[PDB]
């Protein structure tokens, strides 16, 4: 049956190439021999056998077989190398996680400078992203690594979230100890810079807000190399963490340790005065310092910016593919 995973062989896919270096193994583009469907295979290596199957892949197998949303990538199945060993002890073959192939990733589109997003594109993009994030948050899952690389985009304009290797369950009742440094610094929330370890699902909202801003500048907002400098950049824009705007900031471990040069005032609306108002309000609320005052995913969908976006009229990005080959004089 379709459900009997782990048995079908990777012979069933013609490997096209390598689409990236992954955490537990390389990711390959491939074509299904039977159906012709283009897929993506993530290689899982148990040959290290320090801790057997890596947990990063276990989380992605556990969570993505539960999550069914248009803006959440679908794991189609899991296939294996020809074992070629009667004895299971000898077998060191790897496992491949089958996923739907996505034509592009946001980082690739923005980094090459090849795309332009109009307001209506950003609306369609952010509605899908935040709807998917809502589905996940309502299911008590935290992505914990939202970055432009992890946001896949099909040429039609469909957005799918895809790197659930650092994703874990969230309980609003029992606060649990967690791994503090879980997001990329450019997209990391101020709470995780000051070391909450008791992070809320509003860590993922901060990341998406950085992307919202980035889609309007074509450049990331808080680009830094070290944790303190990021807090400085965030503070220059959002204001310095102070108990007046974030009363529980004093409880965070590194609040006294890590301090910005000044107690900066918030200038987010001034430095983003070139953004539409509906979006500026979305950005201002998403980039709120206090995670308990930061907006939820649902609240973003019930905003003037995204409320009335109709996703039937999806908006493909510009994605020029001709006459960019030869530059115009």
């Amino acid at each position: 049956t379709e459900s009997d995973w782990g048995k079908r062989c990777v012979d069933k896919f013609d490997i096209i190439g390598i689409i990236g270096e992954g955490t537990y193994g390389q990711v390959y583009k491939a074509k299904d021999k039977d159906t012709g469907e283009l897929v993506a295979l993530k290689k899982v290596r148990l040959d290290n056998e320090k801790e057997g199957f890596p947990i990063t892949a276990i989380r992605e197998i556990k969570i993505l077989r539960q999550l069914i949303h248009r803006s959440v990538v679908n794991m189609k199945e899991i296939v294996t190398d020809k074992q070629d060993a009667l004895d299971f002890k000898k077998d060191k073959g790897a496992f491949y996680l089958v996923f739907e192939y996505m034509d592009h990733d946001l980082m690739g589109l923005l980094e090459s400078g090849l795309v332009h997003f109009s307001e209506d594109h950003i609306k369609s993009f952010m509605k899908q992203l935040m709807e998917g994030l809502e589905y996940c948050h309502k299911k008590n899952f935290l992505h914990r690594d939202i970055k432009c690389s992890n946001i896949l985009l099909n040429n039609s304009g469909q957005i799918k979230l895809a790197d659930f290797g650092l994703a874990r369950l969230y309980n609003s009742e029992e606060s649990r100890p967690y791994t503090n440094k879980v997001i990329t610094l450019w997209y990391r929330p101020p709470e995780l810079l000051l070391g909450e370890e008791r992070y809320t699902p509003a860590i993922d909202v901060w990341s998406c807000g950085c992307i919202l801003g980035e889609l309007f500048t074509k450049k990331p907002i808080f680009q830094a190399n070290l944790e303190l400098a990021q807090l400085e950049l965030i503070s220059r824009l959002c204001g310095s963490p102070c108990p007046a705007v974030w009363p529980d900031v004093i409880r965070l471990p590194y609040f006294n340790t890590m301090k910005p040069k000044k107690q900066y005032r918030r200038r987010l609306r001034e430095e983003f005065s070139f953004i539409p108002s509906a979006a500026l309000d979305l950005l201002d609320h998403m980039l709120t310092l206090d995670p308990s005052k930061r907006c939820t995913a649902e609240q973003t969908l019930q905003s003037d910016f995204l409320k009335d976006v109709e996703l039937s009229k999806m908006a493909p990005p510009d994605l020029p593919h001709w006459q960019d080959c030869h530059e115009l004089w």
Partner: peptide, 13 residues
Amino acid sequence: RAHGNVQDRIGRP
């Protein structure tokens, strides 16, 4: 006579 870099941290070219 005078020198400086006028780049803004945030802005759309």
